[PDB]
Amino acid sequence: PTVERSTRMSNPWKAFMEKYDIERTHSSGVRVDLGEDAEVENAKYRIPAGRCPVFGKGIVIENSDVSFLRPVATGGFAFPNANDHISPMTLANLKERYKDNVEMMKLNDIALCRTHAASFVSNYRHPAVYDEKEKTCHMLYLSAQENMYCSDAVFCFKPDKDESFENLVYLSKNVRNDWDKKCPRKNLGNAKFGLWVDGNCEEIPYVKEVEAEDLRECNRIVFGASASDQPTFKSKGRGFNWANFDSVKKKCYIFNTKPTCLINDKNFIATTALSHPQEVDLEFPCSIYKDEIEREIKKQERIVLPRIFISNDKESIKCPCEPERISQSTCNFYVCNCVEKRAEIKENNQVVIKEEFRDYYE
Structure with a gap:
């Protein structure tokens, strides 16, 4: 004996952590997602390609008060005119339109929004924003996410996360219908991301340290710092995508290497560039x-x-x-x-x- x-x-965290492997699971930019090419007639264009929803992302228009969710001046970024009959569309209206489609009725609300938006005609398909608070699906007519120096005579805009966008979910045409099992959403309370080193979860030695007043701000900073397809390239999801929030020191530690386990620490929340700005699950496994x-x-x-x-x-x-x-x-x-x-x-x-x-x- x-x-x-x-x-x-x-590594006993293997299955738990797959969803945080943003390179493998999302595979495109986060802050700006322009991961695929598509041609309309002859004309090569860039379009959002990521496989995960980005919780709480929206587009801020500089020195303007119009929301990007306003139909484009036939204004914001959204589908125009139409009859209001394709966008915006409420969940109820989506469930109405697709009632006799057994498969589309099986989709969760985000996936149903994404699927609807992505169906309209090239592999050029439009990104969508689902407003989970209003249960309303918006198709985005403009796929650009940034035009930022800004050198008023120029139309300036940038992606951001802030309270007015917190219920929004930015959806490329590629988003997985099973995003809820495969992608980040909630923040992990009583936890910090770490690296598995032969039998224990260890601190990530190379991080960038940033001041943050609360979770929202740490999740905003990492969003800002995250994989970006914006011209100075395809990031392929590589980037400073992950952050540990020290709730007590009020610091945000961002990093660019995928984490492989969690460290149980009562002072921290583990967040990512994709993650909801606020939801936190306090129950460590x-x-x-x-x-x-x-x-x-x-x-x-x-x-x-x-x-x-x-x-x-x-x-x-x-x-x-x-x-x-x-x-x-x-x-x-x-x-x-x-x-x-x-x-x-x-x-x-x-x-x-x-x-x-x-x-x-x-």
Whole structure:
């Protein structure tokens, strides 16, 4: 009856974190999304391409008071004239129009808005804004998101997040219908993003630190700093997309490397450029570590314990020494600091196998 440590280098956050891999899941600009090309007759144009909704984004028109959701002066960015019969359209009106379509009736409200907007005729399809407070779908006739120096005689505008846009959802024609499982929306309370380094979630060493008065402002800053397809290129979703908000220090730490786990810390909220400006879920998944450890022990003599060195059950880790209690932790997590680490974080926030172990891991 032996117990031993696994050599297998896992990560129990794998499934939980896929949605935060913005490069892989969204794959286009966030602050400005112009990720695809489309031609109308002969004429190459750029259009929004991201696969995730961007919560709380809108377009500010400089030195103007017209909302971008106003129909274009046949004004804002929205579809004009029509009869009001294609845009704007209420959820009720959308549900009316598409009532005998079994598949369109299965879509959630955002996806139904997106699908409607994207159906109108090239692979040139129009982006939409769904106002979740008014339950109203707006098709955007103008796909430009920024014209900013601004060198009144010039039409200046930029994307932004602020309170008047907080219920808005900016939708490209590519947005996934299952965005709710695959994309960011809510902010993660009692958590900061981190990097998984052989059995514990570690701080991201290279970040940009910024003053922020509240979550809204931190989510606005990261939005501002986020992947952008705007000419000076296709970002492909690469960018400073993620931020940790220190609720107590009133600081925003932004970074450009995708996170691979969460650190349970009562002082922080984890937000992203896509995420809602305000919604916060305070319930950390405390049981993530104990679950994998227990699941593995139910593999089978030889007990082989995972390389998981943090848990809410201090004995399950089988620490060589006394596990440290993490005081910042709402989960009352314990960490085993006194173990053999096979990975370390190096420049540009890259997690690498330590030298002494490289040959073994191939």
